[PDB]
Every structure is written in C-alpha cells, then in structure tokens.
C-alpha cells in the first residue's frame, strides 16, 4: 500500500510533462513559422 501510494503520487509529474509539452508544441509551430 505504501509503495503504490508512492507511485500514484508521481502521476502528478505526468500531467505536468503533459502541459509543458503542449507549450513546446505551440512554441515550435512559432519557430516553424519563421
């Protein structure tokens, strides 16, 4: 139980990675526009 709770907590990193990648996608479209 303690170890699964630890795994479940790190799932916060995944969506943070998720949001940042959204910004990287838009920012790259900008560079591509140049």
């Amino acid at each position: 139980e303690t170890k699964v709770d630890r795994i479940l907590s790190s799932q916060s990193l995944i969506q943070t990675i998720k949001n940042d990648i959204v910004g990287l996608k838009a920012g790259m479209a900008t560079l591509e526009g140049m």
Partner: protein
Amino acid sequence: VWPPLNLPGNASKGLTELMNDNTEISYEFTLKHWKEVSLIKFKKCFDADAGEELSIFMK
C-alpha cells in the same frame, strides 16, 4: 461570437476566453502570451466575400 477558430495552441485560459465568448481581450492580457490565434489554413474563406463596389474600376 468571434472567428470560427481562434484558439490553436497552449493555455486553457485563451480557450476559456474562446468558449466563453468574452467580448474583450485586454492588451495587458494578450501581452502575456504568444500566437493568440492562428487564423492560418489552406481551405476556405471567413467572414467576407468579394466582387462588389462597382466604383473603383470606373476610376
């Protein structure tokens, strides 16, 4: 409402402005972002048409 597509990119806040149809986008706000919209494609035409005003060619 505004244009048919006005929110391509990041930040759900611009997406909020879009889906909510806020009549205003503060300069102070839009300074804090990039590519506030990308009305760029190769398909169709928006919000206009041509072939009018018979004046000009007569000049």
